[PDB]
Structure formats: structure tokens, C-alpha cells
Design a protein around this nucleic acid. Structure first.
Length: 451
RNA sequence: AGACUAA
């Protein structure tokens, strides 16, 4: 047993048995990170188990280190720095880092125990990782623990909280406003506002700042300097991407959740291509996770979750289900086996077994295009499977007429490393590399041969 | 679009 705040002295021994996959479904804020995780890790250490801990984001990683502080843990994330002497038997990294290590070489330790926090996270690398982990368990090589307040089959956007939550439906601005939304700025407490993009985040944040509001902007690019600022009292608004969807312990009184996002979609009508569809509603799980950022403190009972619209459960057309298979078809166990998807995540699309398996230099190229090229999984797969090498940028120029990239209604031209001038016209179209002007800038760099 | 940045 334990007191409210401390980890339990007693841990069930059956969670450590090879062949056991434990799904731990608790409600948001039930001490999964501050109590449960350190109990598990302390007991893993006493059992001398080679242990892997997985966080979906650097936000969760940061929160885990707070709870695990003092334990001999090798942190493999830029989010945490600590004194490591490479004799640690416990490793901690992000979901996607692990999948990257599995795909690279880089040989991965033979973990006896794997703890995946936020095991519902649908990023393709995270889906692929659960495939690998559930296969290790099934082979009898590991025990694993999947922890999530919103497991597969979650439908409830309004789950249990530690403190009452006032759920309010209101129209929420997706852009700057001049009037008509006084309730946003009249509110006297702290707000966490979820935005689908950094562009929208910048625009919303500037609007609030000119209303005399103190705003912290949180996303992948600003995490390092701005996340520690959220722990101060010094702010009115955190305007955040879903970097903060899970785990975050803001000291807020209100969440604003527009409940919408862009979705990458693979089109099969004509030449295969990726578009950014929407905005469309987020899933019930995302909505519940965002709402879970408040109602966490029993002494503070008037927290609000302000939202717009219903969530949308069906995400079967999302590119992540295909991209997860593209990754997993190229991951192996030391025994040679290609892992299968975690049970509940099978048949999300119709996915001929092994159809994404790449051979030799193609697999290496695939990995290179993702981690050096900064290209999406689908586009990386398409280029690599064509037998194109990483530094061969010819495919950026040889597409059909309709694949010509336009920026400000003008045909994009590229000046190559060798000094040729060529129209940017990729053989394969993935909206993720050209839609946002910043992504286009990066993709132009790649087409040039400067990446 | 968002997340990740190992070894």
C-alpha cells in the first residue's frame, strides 16, 4: 500500500513474467507517472530486468524524469539530461526513437521488460513499436506493460477526473479575432489552448498578446526554452500543439479544445498520393487526453473544458495505419522474425502481409530518407522501393505535368548542387512536404541536394 | 499537419 502521493511498496509479480502483456487502463491523472511507473521501475531493478521505458513526447519524458529522479536511468532524449554511466539497465526514450533504433544499425538491447506509456498513441512509429513489443512478448522474450487512460475501444470523450470538470460547448476561433469572444480573455485563470498547427498557434498567440495576455507557445520547435516556463506562475495562456496532449501537468484552470486537426490521407483514385485532409474532428481519445490536462487537482474544483463539436472515432483513412506497416515490415527480431501489429490495431486497413518489406540497400535508403531527408514515411517508402539511392534527387523533377509544385501561384524552380535550374515536379506527391511554406522550404533544400 | 532526433 501507499499514501496518496508515494509509489506503492507492493508490485504484482505477474506483470514481470515473460509472455505477459499487461494493459493498465487508469483514468487521466490517477498517478500513472508519479506513482505507478516508479513502483514498476524500482521492482524491475530489484529483479535485474533489462528495462525499456517509452514516452510518446518530450513532455511525457520530462514528467517521467521528475517522478523517476534518483533512480539509475539512461535517458536517451534531448528532453532530459542526467549523469549516466553506461552500466544502467533501464533506458528511457520516446516511442519514435525506439522505432528508429529498430530500423537502423544501431543494435537494440534485449529488453526483458518494456513499459510503453500512452500506449494508444497513433503516430505510425508508435503503432509499429507496439507491433514489435507484442511480438517480443508472444515469443516469450519479454514482458510488457501498456499504460493508457484511453485504450483501443475508447469512445468516451469525458472520462473520470480527480476533480469535477465543467464541460462547455462554444464556438472556438481558429484564427485571430477582433470581437465576439470576450469569454476567452475575460476568464481570470490559466488556459491551455490546443492548436492543430504552429501557424494557427502563432496567430492565436499574437491575438492574445495584444490583449495584454502572457502567452507561452509550445510545440516541437519551442519545447526546450518554453516548457520549463510553464512550471512558473508567470503566464495566462499556453497555446500548444498536441505535444502537450498527454502527460502534461500544467497548473491550469481551463482547457480550450477546438477538437480538430489536419489528417494525412493516402488517395488511391488515380496515381497514389498523400493529401492533407480537413480540418476534421480529432478522435475521442485525443479529446479525452486534452480534457485530462485539467480536473487533476482535488482542491481546485471549478476547472473548465471548453470544446467545439463532436469527435470522430473512425480514422481508418488516416495515413498512419499504412505508414505503421511500412515501418513494421522492415523491423526484425534477433531471431529473424518480422513483427505483427498489436492485436486491436490489425485490419485498420486491408494490408497484405509483408507487402512493404524492402531488400538490402533499399531498407537503408528508406531509413536515410526519413531521418536525414526529413521526408514522411509514405514518400520515403515510395522513393526507396523504386530502387533510388538517398543522394539521387532525379525523382524530384521527373513527375507528370500535374505534379508541378506551385508556390504563390508560380511554378517552383530549383537550383541544384551542380547548378542546373529545374522545375520542382516530384514523381510522388505528398502534401506534407509542400503544403506549409516552411515544409516546402525544407523540401526545396532536399531537391537541391543540400540535405 | 502534428510528434521523434537514438545509437
Amino acid at each position: 500500500g501507499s499514501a496518496m502521493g508515494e509509489p506503492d511498496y507492493e508490485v504484482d509479480e505477474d506483470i514481470f513474467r515473460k509472455k505477459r502483456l499487461t494493459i493498465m487502463d487508469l483514468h487521466p491523472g490517477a498517478g500513472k507517472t508519479k506513482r505507478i511507473l516508479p513502483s514498476i521501475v524500482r521492482e524491475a531493478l530489484k529483479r535485474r530486468l533489462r528495462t525499456l521505458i517509452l514516452a510518446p513526447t518530450r513532455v511525457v519524458a520530462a514528467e517521467m524524469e521528475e517522478a523517476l529522479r534518483g533512480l539509475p536511468i539512461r535517458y536517451q532524449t534531448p528532453a532530459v539530461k542526467s549523469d549516466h554511466t553506461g552500466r544502467e539497465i533501464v533506458d528511457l526514450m520516446c516511442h519514435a526513437t525506439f522505432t528508429t533504433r529498430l530500423l537502423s544499425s544501431t543494435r537494440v538491447p534485449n529488453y526483458n521488460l518494456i513499459v510503453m506509456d500512452e500506449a494508444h498513441f497513433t503516430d505510425p512509429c508508435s503503432v509499429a513499436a507496439r507491433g514489435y513489443i507484442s511480438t517480443r512478448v508472444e515469443m516469450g522474450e519479454a514482458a510488457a506493460i501498456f499504460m493508457t487512460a484511453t485504450p483501443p475501444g475508447s469512445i468516451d470523450p469525458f472520462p473520470q477526473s480527480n476533480s469535477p470538470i465543467e464541460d462547455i460547448e462554444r464556438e472556438i476561433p481558429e484564427r485571430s479575432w477582433n470581437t465576439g469572444f470576450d469569454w476567452i480573455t475575460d476568464y481570470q485563470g490559466k488556459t491551455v489552448w490546443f492548436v492543430p498547427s504552429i501557424k494557427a498557434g502563432n496567430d492565436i498567440a499574437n491575438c492574445l498578446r495584444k490583449s495584454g495576455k502572457r502567452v507561452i507557445q509550445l510545440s516541437r520547435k519551442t519545447f526546450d526554452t518554453e516548457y520549463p516556463k510553464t512550471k512558473l506562475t508567470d503566464w495566462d495562456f499556453v497555446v500548444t500543439t498536441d505535444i502537450s496532449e498527454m502527460g502534461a501537468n500544467f497548473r491550469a484552470g481551463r482547457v480550450i479544445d477546438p477538437r480538430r486537426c489536419l489528417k494525412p490521407v493516402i488517395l488511391t483514385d488515380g496515381p497514389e498520393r498523400v493529401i492533407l485532409a480537413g480540418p476534421i474532428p480529432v478522435t475521442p481519445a485525443s479529446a479525452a487526453q486534452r480534457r485530462g490536462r485539467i480536473g487533476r487537482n482535488p482542491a481546485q474544483e471549478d476547472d473548465q473544458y471548453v470544446f467545439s463539436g463532436d469527435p470522430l472515432k473512425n480514422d481508418e483513412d488516416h495515413a498512419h495505419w499504412t505508414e505503421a506497416k511500412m515501418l513494421l515490415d522492415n523491423i526484425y527480431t534477433p531471431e529473424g522474425i518480422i513483427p505483427t501489429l498489436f492485436g486491436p490495431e490489425r485490419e485498420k486497413t486491408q494490408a497484405i502481409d509483408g507487402e512493404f518489406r524492402l531488400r538490402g540497400e533499399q531498407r537503408k535508403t528508406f531509413v536515410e530518407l526519413m531521418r536525414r531527408g526529413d521526408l514522411p514515411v509514405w514518400l520515403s517508402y515510395k522513393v526507396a522501393s523504386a530502387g533510388i539511392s538517398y543522394k539521387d534527387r532525379e525523382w524530384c523533377f521527373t513527375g507528370e505535368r500535374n505534379n508541378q509544385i506551385l508556390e504563390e501561384n508560380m511554378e517552383v524552380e530549383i537550383w541544384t548542387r551542380e547548378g542546373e535550374k529545374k522545375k520542382l515536379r516530384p514523381k510522388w506527391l505528398d502534401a506534407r512536404v509542400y503544403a506549409d511554406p516552411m515544409a516546402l522550404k525544407d523540401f526545396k533544400e532536399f531537391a537541391s541536394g543540400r540535405k
